[PDB]
Amino acid sequence: GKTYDVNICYAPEDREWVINTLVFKLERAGIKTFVNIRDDTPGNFFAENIMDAIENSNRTIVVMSPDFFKNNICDKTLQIGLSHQIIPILYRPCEVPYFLNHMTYLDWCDKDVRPVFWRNLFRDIRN
């Protein structure tokens, strides 16, 4: 019942794939997406933009990578996201923190099952 179907939480180092592949495909599929570089409010505090994205979206996609887990905004977003619903994507191999080590994720790195990645992602969002 939220304005956006999904918010995308990601590190700037992964922007190329996130914007040109993930957001591109989501929007083509009719999925309404909050993306910081378009939808953040300039002059709001970081925490305000985090909260706007989370509370106005049904779920938060978490784009896991080594750079995600070194990024302050990503961590703060994730912590609040755990109190709602998240869709973790393993985009690049990394050390996944203990509190995510028992959560099912969509594994982009597993090339042989890549043929079902988008099906699975879109199904969850639409469910």
Partner: peptide
Amino acid sequence: HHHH
């Protein structure tokens, strides 16, 4: 359907 909501997670969890």
